From Swiss-Prot, chains A, B:
Entry's disease: Neurodevelopmental disorder with hypotonia, dysmorphic facies, and skeletal anomalies, with or without seizures: An autosomal dominant disorder characterized by global developmental delay, moderate to severely impaired intellectual development, poor or absent speech, congenital hypotonia, dysmorphic facial features, exotropia, and musculoskeletal issues such as hip dysplasia, hip dislocation and scoliosis. About half of patients develop various types of seizures.
Family classification: Belongs to the transient receptor (TC 1.A.4) family. LTrpC subfamily. TRPM3 sub-subfamily.
Mutagenesis or variant effect for residue 24 to Q: In NEDFSS; gain-of-function variant resulting in increased calcium ion transmembrane transport; basal channel activity is increased and the channel is more sensitive to stimulation by heat or the neurosteroid pregnenolone sulfate; the mutant channel can be inhibited by the TRPM3 antagonist and anti-epileptic drug primidone
Record-annotated membrane-spanning stretches: 21-46
Coverage span on the entire protein: 1053 to 1142 of 1732
Quaternary structure and interacting proteins, as annotated: Homotetramer. Interacts with TRPM1; the interaction results in the formation of a heteromultimeric cation channel complex that are functionally different from the homomeric channels.
Name assigned to this protein: Transient receptor potential cation channel subfamily M member 3
Function, as annotated: Constitutively active, non-selective divalent cation-conducting channel that is permeable to Ca(2+), Mn(2+), and Mg(2+), with a high permeability for Ca(2+). However, can be enhanced by increasing temperature and by ligands, including the endogenous neurosteroid pregnenolone sulfate and sphingosine-1 and suppressed by intracellular Mg(2+). Implicated in a variety of cellular processes, including insulin/peptide secretion, vascular constriction and dilation, noxious heat sensing, inflammatory and spontaneous pain sensitivity.
Summary of the tissues where the protein is detected: Expressed primarily in the kidney and, at lower levels, in brain, testis, ovary, pancreas and spinal cord. Expression in the brain and kidney was determined at protein level. In the kidney, expressed predominantly in the collecting tubular epithelium in the medulla, medullary rays, and periglomerular regions; in the brain, highest levels are found in the cerebellum, choroid plexus, the locus coeruleus, the posterior thalamus and the substantia nigra. Down-regulated in renal tumors compared to normal kidney. Expressed in the lens.
Compartments where located: Cell membrane
Entry superkingdom: Eukaryota
Length: 51, 51
């Protein structure tokens, strides 16, 4: 939503479905809560359910 | 098999051994049952066998 301001309503948006420097930082924290916290929660909950 | 319709029988197919939009979706679910479910099953079964 930040990186494409002028995009008239389009079925193209559906197919996909100004200050860009917020975009790097809040990308990285996503990885910090995707490949760090739940994956290691999934490993913890597929290890103490085996017994 | 979807992405190469006209390929006459060939030893080339062996060396490798129309509506393409099904191809992305059923690719991703493959990763969802390759790098998510069995890898974490392998970690669970190489952790409660050590003792």
């Amino acid at each position: 939503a930040i990186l494409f301001p002028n995009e008239e309503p389009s079925w193209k948006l559906a197919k996909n479905i100004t200050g860009a420097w917020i975009v790097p930082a809040i990308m990285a924290c996503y990885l910090l809560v995707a490949n760090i916290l739940l994956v290691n929660l999934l490993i913890a909950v597929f290890n103490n359910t085996f017994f």
